Amino acid sequence: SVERVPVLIVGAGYAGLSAATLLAWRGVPCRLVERRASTSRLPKAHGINRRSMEVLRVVPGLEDALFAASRAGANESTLIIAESVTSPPIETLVTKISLDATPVSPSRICTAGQDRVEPVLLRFARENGADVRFSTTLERFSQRDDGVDAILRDEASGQETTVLADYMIAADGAGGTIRDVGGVKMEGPGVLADTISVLFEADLDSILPGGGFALYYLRNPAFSGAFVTCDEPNHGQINIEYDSTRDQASDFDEERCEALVRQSLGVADLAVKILDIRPWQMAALLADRMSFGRVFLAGDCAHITPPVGGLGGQTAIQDAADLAWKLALVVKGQAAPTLLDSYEIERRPVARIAIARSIANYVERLLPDRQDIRIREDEYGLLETAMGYRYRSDAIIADEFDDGACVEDPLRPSGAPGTRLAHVWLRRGEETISSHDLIGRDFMLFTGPDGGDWIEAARRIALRSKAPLGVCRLGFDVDDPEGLFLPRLRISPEGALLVRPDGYIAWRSRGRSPDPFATLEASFARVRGFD
Amino acid sequence: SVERVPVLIVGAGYAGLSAATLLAWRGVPCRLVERRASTSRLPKAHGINRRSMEVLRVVPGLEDALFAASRAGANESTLIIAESVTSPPIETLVTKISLDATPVSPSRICTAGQDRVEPVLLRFARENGADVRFSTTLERFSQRDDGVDAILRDEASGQETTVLADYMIAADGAGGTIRDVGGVKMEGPGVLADTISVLFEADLDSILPGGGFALYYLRNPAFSGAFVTCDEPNHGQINIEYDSTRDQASDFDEERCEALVRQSLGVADLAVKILDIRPWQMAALLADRMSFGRVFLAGDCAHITPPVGGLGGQTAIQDAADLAWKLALVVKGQAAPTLLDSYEIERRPVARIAIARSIANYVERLLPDRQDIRIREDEYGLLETAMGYRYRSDAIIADEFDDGACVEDPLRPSGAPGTRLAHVWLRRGEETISSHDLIGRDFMLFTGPDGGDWIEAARRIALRSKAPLGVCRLGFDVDDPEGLFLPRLRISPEGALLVRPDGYIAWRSRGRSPDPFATLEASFARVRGFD
Amino acid sequence: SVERVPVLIVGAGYAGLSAATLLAWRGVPCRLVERRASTSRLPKAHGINRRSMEVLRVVPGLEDALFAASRAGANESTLIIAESVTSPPIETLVTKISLDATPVSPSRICTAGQDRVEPVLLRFARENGADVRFSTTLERFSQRDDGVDAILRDEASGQETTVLADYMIAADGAGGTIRDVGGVKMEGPGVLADTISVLFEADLDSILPGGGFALYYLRNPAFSGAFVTCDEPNHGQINIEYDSTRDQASDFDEERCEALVRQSLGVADLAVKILDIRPWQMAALLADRMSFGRVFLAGDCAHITPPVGGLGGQTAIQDAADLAWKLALVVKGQAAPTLLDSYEIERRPVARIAIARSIANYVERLLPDRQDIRIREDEYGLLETAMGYRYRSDAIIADEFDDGACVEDPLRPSGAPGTRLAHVWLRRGEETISSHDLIGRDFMLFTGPDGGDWIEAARRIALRSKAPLGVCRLGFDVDDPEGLFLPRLRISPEGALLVRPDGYIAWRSRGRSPDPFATLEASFARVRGFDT
Ligand SMILES: Cc1cc2nc3c(=O)[nH]c(=O)nc-3n(C[C@H](O)[C@H](O)[C@H](O)COP(=O)(O)OP(=O)(O)OC[C@H]3O[C@@H](n4cnc5c(N)ncnc54)[C@H](O)[C@@H]3O)c2cc1C
Ligand SMILES: Cc1cc2nc3c(=O)[nH]c(=O)nc-3n(C[C@H](O)[C@H](O)[C@H](O)COP(=O)(O)OP(=O)(O)OC[C@H]3O[C@@H](n4cnc5c(N)ncnc54)[C@H](O)[C@@H]3O)c2cc1C
Ligand SMILES: Cc1cc2nc3c(=O)[nH]c(=O)nc-3n(C[C@H](O)[C@H](O)[C@H](O)COP(=O)(O)OP(=O)(O)OC[C@H]3O[C@@H](n4cnc5c(N)ncnc54)[C@H](O)[C@@H]3O)c2cc1C
Ligand SMILES: [Br-]
Ligand SMILES: [Br-]
Ligand SMILES: [Br-]
Ligand SMILES: [Br-]
Ligand SMILES: [Br-]
Ligand SMILES: [Br-]
Ligand SMILES: [Br-]
Ligand SMILES: [Br-]
Ligand SMILES: [Br-]
Ligand SMILES: [Br-]
Ligand SMILES: [Br-]
Ligand SMILES: [Br-]
Ligand SMILES: [Br-]
Ligand code: NA
């Protein structure tokens, strides 16, 4: 049996499920295959940061559903370093007060665990048309010049079928083997720590009186680890590091783990139900390339990060967001296949900074002595890393005076191409909407109120079906009373600003042009891979 | 037989009197000459911010005195934008509740005017041994090999005199011609507005509710300007911009200024007695050099900033305090004269951002239509600009992988070298002091409780070194009960932290060193100009 | 004794000042004479194209100075066809977006006009040792077997002077008479148009939007011409074609040119200050020969091109560069005089297509009505003409199966001997450089990573060959991560590539050689004019 599909996604985690929901929503028929039988697995990741939600909230209903699926609710997150969760805090890294005082995004922080997120993505992936098939395995594949030939295998029978796809998203995890087909090599420090993860049930309401969602980095003299509060109330997980020379994963039975749950919580005796025990590793590795022919590595198969910064799942989501909009343009013929060359160019350095940020969080919060393992070249600030990372590819018309910075303070936007369009409230009559509520579907061209020569130029381009472009004239379609949009992005009232479907600035004009149509038509062509 | 002096100061505004007050307190005999007969002139500036009060409070008694000389007192400051001082607010920028909600400093805001501040500074300069000669003018000068040959002149007789100085601080104001001797070119936007300042007396208690300090930025349809309250009660000041192509300075006689006072106040029946009228310019200019030879430019002669934000007089004070401690070391043989090369490389960027900040306050507050004059690359937060600027020079051992950040949030301190040592309520036994109460006089070495290797290295250093070095070990000399000092500065219990006499961090070690003496000795030598 | 100088250059335009700058930078003492008293003239040309900037950039500081002297800054060029400079464009041929999206060269487009470009060249010629004497004329000359003896004449006085010179670069412009001493015939269409050129001053700021360089081809119903922005702010220049039978050059007084400046600008009520009015012509003529004896014709004196392509000032520069590296070898005794026979062999066909390209642009852009003047036999693409021209001569060891093509697409390089070395971004350690940053001074030998046999041959050659030979290995000295250089030029890792001082490939071996010393020696010798 042989069927064809535009996009084939292998893997039903954060990367693959996001890729399918966004590719579905943007009108691209896809099929997702996943070896497991359901999303039902132990939670690993907790929380969706602001940028992850920005790329996901273009899908109607998705954001509220993610927040409804959470126990703690919006911005209700605390981060503490201590010797145990009942010990005096060594330091307090984040609170609801601190998240509320950083209005850098139309979205707040969502705290939901992976065990709650993956079903909601599956839900919206299917509602918008994705073909998600569980208990189905990519057995093997090869690439002809016009598509991928994939062999699929039913886990219940072993019966095989062939699917032909224009493109395939390898989303197959840290241990994923699709990349080996392409000879990609994971480079980096490698495995830095052996860990053992324990899921337990216990009276957590009393120990943690006023925290909705809590994460404690436990830095004590017996061991190092962390404790997280799960979405199921009175459920929690600890991830304790162990030395593979002094102990072994087999050595952690129910009796021993109940003591670890009590040591890490700072309680002498507490009734602890051990629900599951898992040995894991903490590694730092980056792929040398993130795509080969028509195969695209997304998520943990492209970049393994130390799970200390909580950046792994978010890079996976944003990886899958970058693929979704770009692939949706290529299969519709609104972009050249060359646009897909920009994927590892833009997304790989982002992964290099996450790995470095994550290593730095691990030293600073858990093992401050181990400064040798850090990559201080690539370290940047926490919000800059999650949210101010910059892109530089042929998918972007750089500013003439580009300083080459890897990040930009989201608090001090310059409006340079390659940066994430700033969040600013605007006015659409008596209602107020974020600038981000005006982007995310097609490209968008913002012009100042004197930007009518650009508007007409954009409307001649947007006449074409090949051309996915809309226009917004400031002071006509929406008003910026405070001057915090186009003035702060250094756009004069005769200027124009082009933003991608992922919300990143692609091109700007401080002011007027001798021929606005030719300027814009050439900008628009170039950034979609045409010449 | 010619009079000889270590430092000669020219001019007795904020810059010059600050320089003399601090130079004298630091044991340096100095002479300040000033053309005018006394301090008594009508005041332009109002207020001393928290950073300026921080460099001034190292002088015993000086901080209380300044607060005592003000009509309104600590944090009693209100900033409003409207169409007249009795029109409904258009915005509100600053309140006593806003400034009480920011415990960034050992000091609060002092609202005293120029006409109040300068006599107090004169008081303490002379008290600390400064030689302040009014009615005396620097007529001309020439730098020799071994000093500056100055020709002083008496305004009463025309009699002239020679003094030889090791160094000369040029504090001669926005128009000062000392800089023209050095080829100093002032660069920037230049004159931005023509203004007229009216000092008046009216029943201000009737139409102003609070009894504290009030500043109204005025956006009339007829004119833009500002109203301020003066320290003499029922005295106020309006600084109104005017178009030089439509009206000229001479056109503003008592009658017209009486009309302007009533317009800008909103009461068209109020009796107004015009005490002075003054034309003035609003300008933006920066010097290419802030030193040449043994001459140093401090205050308005080095940087003319628009007077919206009140940064011009605060920079002057802080220029002066930078000179006072570096000069004090160099004339004491305790630093190499190379240290003075750090004056303009540390101070000129601080003035660069203040010029950009004041332009931005001006546009945002008074002329939102003039977005084009802004210098947006150099604009930072209001509290970053006044207080979180950073210093990069050879007077500062920069921590490697420096990101080049021009400011740092005072609220989120990192302890990196070239930043202002954070304010933290420590405990000296039962006394509760500020971290700032332990700095200011000599170089200070803080260390963590396990940092005794540094301490003894420090003590052996100071035996030889010409410059003192104070030490203070945490948990011993002072106590940090809530880990908000050395921990938050990312200094381990075995680390150390070298703070300059101006309170800025010169060098840090996160932990131990294999030869702590050799690293401290090298550091301490390098941060005083030796190589 | 007589004043003796290695190369005498006559004329200080693009050709002559480029020859002087490059000769002096290559170590050749030379004398340039120019009849005029300073470089100060009216701006004619605008722009230095990418290829011209490659041959000029070898001289340290020169490229930065040319961009520094220009009002508009790199790639900030708009070409537009319209009825007036305020009419809606008929077609826009070029934008900065279009120019930035063509990474064919290390250099970008400099927009500086002739009045800016000529002082920069004179400055760099002199910094490098060139002897430039204004208010000096070549009065007459003759050739010997050992040089040209020249009579120089002072314009202030008419005092005359003899100088004997190994070689004489004839760079004396379209009107130049040096070629007539050689009996050089100019051949081709001849004069195609009479034109008048008006230099004016007007508030162009409040008319032109963008603040960069702009050239407008005017398809006005009343007339055909062109407006150009000048480097001096609020200065422009119009080149208006007039019918010599209906009007004559003397009929364009200040009142009429002010009218022209308003029509071709489209602004009815505009203040025009006429600064100069000049009648000119627009011709297409190619020289019989481009050298005779020790005299080499460089610049417009060897090829007059219609000024629509904008290739005449560019061909002059590249003429000069070709002569400069070749004379520099011959006068240093590092190359046989034979090498100079290749000058006109290689440069004349390049002028032939520049003329054909320029005629084709004048017709397409301004007068589409009469294609009868086109030389379609020699028309090629714009970038192919400017940049992808090919050299065939006894100075390039032609590979087997020569196609015969006059041009090659610079975007699809093949590595054939006789083509320009492709611009490839390479890595030297941490820094990223161009392949071109590695060429320009001496002959360069590129080998693959497994080409030590060539490098060893080359280092022993260089040890006693009169000319220097540099070597660079693609595994060691610089890195080519994306295999875009030697793989794409069809060179295996045991191959080598020989590149001339002008950057054109002279010889290639795709694999190993049975005697790598023998083949490299005979190749290095032949490409320098030595026989067998
Ligand atoms: C202890 C821990 C805590 C973490 N905490 C956080 C956190 O707080 N925040 C955060 O953002 N991130 C966190 N992370 C990281 C985050 O969980 C992962 O980065 C993220 O889930 C990776 O998603 P993915 O889609 O790349 O891969 P995966 O979740 O690995 O999914 C890949 C899927 O591929 C399937 N598959 C593989 N091969 C095939 C095949 N041939 N056919 C079919 N299916 C196949 C597998 O069955 C699997 O479901 C944490 C990680 C750990 C270990
Ligand atoms: C309307 C207005 C409002 C302002 N408001 C504020 C505010 O709220 N807050 C604030 O911080 N700043 C404010 N400023 C700015 C502030 O007043 C100045 O920046 C500050 O006074 C500069 O001090 P200075 O010592 O550099 O110079 P000046 O005050 O100009 O003093 C220099 C002195 O040098 C003397 N002098 C010059 N040449 C000689 C010579 N040859 N011999 C002897 N003496 C000489 C002069 O007589 C003069 O007194 C305001 C300015 C204006 C115009
Ligand atoms: C309207 C117009 C626009 C143009 N636009 C462009 C353009 O955009 N781009 C471009 O590349 N080209 C352009 N050109 C062409 C460009 O101007 C020429 O190709 C170039 O300037 C020729 O340089 P040259 O050195 O050959 O000659 P010339 O500029 O003619 O210099 C020759 C010199 O020789 C001197 N001379 C002559 N006889 C003697 C003697 N006996 N002794 C001493 N000195 C002597 C002359 O005084 C003269 O200065 C344009 C031309 C025109 C007319
Ligand atoms: Br975030
Ligand atoms: Br299913
Ligand atoms: Br709970
Ligand atoms: Br992670
Ligand atoms: Br706007
Ligand atoms: Br299109
Ligand atoms: Br002291
Ligand atoms: Br402050
Ligand atoms: Br003076
Ligand atoms: Br000020
Ligand atoms: Br401590
Ligand atoms: Br070109
Ligand atoms: Br031309
Ligand atoms: Na469209």
Numbering used by the authors:
A (entry chain B), B (entry chain A): 2 to 532
C (entry chain C): 2 to 533
Could you give the paper's own sentences about this structure?
One such protein is MbnF, which is proposed to be a flavin monooxygenase (FMO) based on homology.
Diffraction data were collected at the Advanced Photon Source (APS). The structure of MbnF was solved by molecular replacement and refined to a resolution of 2.61 Å. RdmE is 39% identical to MbnF over 96% of its length and superimposes with an r.m.s.d. of 3.2 Å. The two phosphate moieties of FAD are positioned at the N-terminal end of helix 2, implying that the dipole of the helix may contribute to the coordination of FAD. In all three monomers of the asymmetric unit, electron-density features interpreted as bromide ions are observed coordinated between the isoalloxazine ring of the FAD and the N-terminal end of helix 2. The presence of these anions may indicate the coordination of negatively charged groups present in the substrate. It is also of note that adjacent to the isoalloxazine ring is a channel that appears to be large enough to accommodate a peptide. Moreover, a nearly identical interface is observed between chain B and a symmetry-related copy of chain C: the A–A dimer and the B–C dimers superimpose with an r.m.s.d. of only 0.56 Å for 530 Cα pairs. The substantial binding area together with the presence of the dimer in two crystallographically non-equivalent arrangements suggest that the dimer might be important under in vivo conditions even if it is not directly observed by size-exclusion chromatography.
